[model samples]
Target chain A: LKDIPEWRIPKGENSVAACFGPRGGFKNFGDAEFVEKGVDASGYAQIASLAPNVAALLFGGNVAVRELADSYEITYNYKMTVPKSDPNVELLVSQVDAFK
Target chain B: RDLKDIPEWRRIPKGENSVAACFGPRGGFKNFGDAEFVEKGVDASGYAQIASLAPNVAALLFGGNVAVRELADSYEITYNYKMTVPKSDPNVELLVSQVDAFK
Candidate 1:
């Protein structure tokens, strides 16, 4: 993955749902059009930035989202796979995946 | 960048929503034309394959040149997707702006 950008704005409800909701997850894609129809240009930028972060987690495994009235929390479970030939590449198993 | 130098970059499973049709030896999409062809249902899968991924769902596809690198233990991949729309479409501005901001 490239340097995943940080989301500029607070994650919106529907966009957040599209990424981390139950029907969400990477494979179960939710259309940004539905969540972003009324949202202005800047809103999409935020989504664009955040999408990469979500994608990174999905690349690993399923993620769970906890919604709050004003904010949300994202969580996930994942495992790492490394080649038998090298040990340096073994760090991501502990470095990447999951969020607070 | 010459792709051959990056031997670690290898193809991996892409999103089912991918509409990519042809790949180059470098592991990237052949070109926009090929992507357009993929959008046109030229592949054996036909139009339904691309149709199923559009309008209602945000389809994220990989390029033919798309490859992965296992750096240390972490893996990395770079990819891009085409959102089929008319050039004269009014929504193009907003879409471009969003993409530009993303960059």
Candidate 2:
């Protein structure tokens, strides 16, 4: 995805909201929580390092939209974060197929 | 057809595609009142012809607000929209994931 960041619509046309750290783990988030799957612990670490920049940009950067992949796509409009030093945030785990 | 009386966005090419984003409240995933999504699939020359990308992509993102240049041309068209808010907003600073297999 190319970052062709351009402010198209007016203010009222779009909004940005976010979620704080989740409980238990990023996996089992609450109803009001937001979660992103398809990544491992190191990914979270990378995200943690990047979340501040993301938050700064979300508040200060212009907004834009893009299309999703397909019909089965579950588009969730929520956001959340994992606290620093959380063990779940530090686990070096990859997706296991045993349970699946 | 009036050769010199057409708009600039009426001359896009074939087989290629593009994706663009715009900010606004367009009843996106949840309609939070101030967020939206906008995507353009057109080529150079400025003309638009959006069709035949696939119905699955159509039904999921656009809800089928597609516009084709010619009914006979099965592989050209333009799809656009104003996405809903809060969720429509993207992380501008986030580096786009570049894992080839993920692509």
Candidate 3:
């Protein structure tokens, strides 16, 4: 994560960040906007200062998104929502074919 | 990182069905290419014959081959899957089985 530079950004007075909604990359990917308002936005300095953090955070967010995405890829990727009821083994066991 | 060290890694012994493939579907080949070329496949069933896992499931298959090994008892089945199968077929692989444990 720290090895990559483009993922980082310069942190200073001219830094401007537009996070893509509250859900972040999970709900909104490729939706981030980070712009330097001044000349400090040069590629060398920007990458050198903060691109790594950007990459690391992006990578971290990606890993989480993968989990959520995979949960729906398979037919058995399911969840049981209790309707304000006490958790019960019988109800939970019904979720898996083996227990049934 | 040397090819000469390959033998050491492969010396897990014979007669042990511990080999598994961490692979994706045919169209998903590019992503798996970055990993070692254990083999290639055209379908989930074909992949199952060798790895027997969903095309793009990224975690352990069968909670790993050893059930009682050191980390074996601690091993768990994670609810993970591939976000998108290469071709985008919604019904290509259906999950019909599962197991749950509680302490």
Candidate 4:
């Protein structure tokens, strides 16, 4: 876990919209909605968080075209980016867990 | 490539993790908007991120009725919106709880 504040997506952000625009979160949200089990964004279905190497690799970082409210918890895009169930999602969380 | 191999968020934690509050401080927890929850994982550094949105939502929702102040770098978003927050807003619990855990 690196102390890269710049790397943190500022929470509640949409990696898709950050790059694509509001259309990102539009494929977007509802409430307490389920974002599936995944890591970053994955198509309209998902958006991955970007960092120095993330966007080029994982795709985009955080930014929203629609400018969302906090913790609204959007839907999983119904398509699926990384797939919340993916083992890698857990891997990402584990990495974040180590930050503490 | 391994997903673990990808270079993800580098900042935002003690080491940088959790859903940090983006607002400055004070009413940060209450003001945090939808974008702040994007980060996944558990760094426990949520309040700092929460701080960024506190004032934004304050003025956005309350308008010219509340008292706003500058607290160093962070802004103070206060006025008792909590009255209707818990039930009205979807994020109130996590909003309040994040502050209690970190503030």
For model 2, residues A1-100, the per-residue Cα lDDT tens digits are 0232221111121211111112222222112111222122124343233122211122112223343542111122222233334343222111111112
User: In order, how many clashes per candidate?
Assistant: 11, 26, 10, 54
C-alpha TM-score for every candidate: 0.23, 0.17, 0.17, 0.19
- Give lDDT tens digits, candidate 3, residues A1-100: 1332111222345232321112222211111122232124333232122111211111111121122333423211211122222233223222122211
Model 4 TM-score on a 0 to 1 scale: 0.19
lDDT per prediction?
0.27, 0.22, 0.21, 0.26
Off by over 4 Å in 4: A1-100, B1-83, B86-90
- The most accurate candidate by DockQ is 3
**Model 4 deviation from the true structure expressed as Cα RMSD, one decimal place:** 18.2
True contacts kept of 3: 0.03
Q: Measured with DockQ on alpha carbons, how good is candidate 1?
A: 0.03
Per-candidate DockQ vs. reference: 0.03, 0.02, 0.05, 0.03
What is the lDDT for A96 in model 3?
21
Tens-place lDDT digits, model 1, residues B1-103:
4433222222111343222311221111121122333233223222233222222112221111112356764445332222233344343332222111111
* Model 3: per-residue Cα lDDT over B10-49, one tens digit each: 2221122111221112122112211122222223232232
The parts of candidate 2 lying over 4 Å away from their true place are A1-100, B1-64, B71-75, B87-103
**Tens-digit lDDT string for candidate 4 (A1-100):** 1332111232234331232222111122211112321122233121123112211111112211121354332110001123344444433222221211
lDDT of 1: 0.27
Q: lDDT by residue for model 4 over B1-103, one digit each (tens)?
A: 4334533332232223233322122232222223333344233245333343232221211111122344444323222211112234443344444322222
